[PDB]
Amino acid sequence: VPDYHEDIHTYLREMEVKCKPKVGYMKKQPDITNSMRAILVDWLVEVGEEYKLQNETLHLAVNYIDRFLSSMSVLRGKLQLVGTAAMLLASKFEEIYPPEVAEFVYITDDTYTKKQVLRMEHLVLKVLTFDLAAPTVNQFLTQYFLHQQPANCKVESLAMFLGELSLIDADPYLKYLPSVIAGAAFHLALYTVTGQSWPESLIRKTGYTLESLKPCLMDLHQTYLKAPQHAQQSIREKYKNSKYHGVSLLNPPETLNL
């Protein structure tokens, strides 16, 4: 327990700054775009569902892709190979048993070789300087869920859903830290289910006021409204499972009452 909850949260706050990607990176990518990055992340969410991977694995993979794309320019023909080695590395970090390399080749429809994927694994670690223990939205939400006043596993699911949705859209969501994304998602999911709001516990722990969250909340409210319409659907189709209380069936509030 809690002998470490405060230390860890503070330190997760330190680490998130050091594991920030460059925000304006996509505009310096010649061959690739926010929209192609959205294809890739959606696809990872499917791959994660196919091989029953944890949600952390997914967020970590997305963090690797962004930091790597911050320093390294990549042709479209090679983005998915970047994605696949990110997902391998994340699984190796986070999973108890990772799917074998072969399976990572298989899920691209045999377009890259095992040896390619392994050589890209190597190159991802070099550019990341073996720094793979990045804080995610998923990590922050889990700590936040400790401060839920009665616990409510529809709120929990619905926030997870929002946080995964932020993975998909680089602009706007790269401008926000994971700890803020998660503040937004938590409040949003809270609000939506019970009509309550981002609680004082967490205001004093995080030092975030509702109103400091406001901008991120506005961006995430829109995504939440627009989700049915988005080109990318894997996360919505993931969150209809009874596993997740089909929170993605639920009804977004049309106003936020700020």
């Binding site: 192609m36 294809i39 890739l40 696809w43 499917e46 479209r76 023909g77 983005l79 998915q80 899920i107 691209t108 429809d109 377009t111």
Partner: peptide, 5 residues
């Protein structure tokens, strides 16, 4: 699934 090309 092969994406892009």
């Amino acid at each position: 699934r092969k994406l892009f090309g």
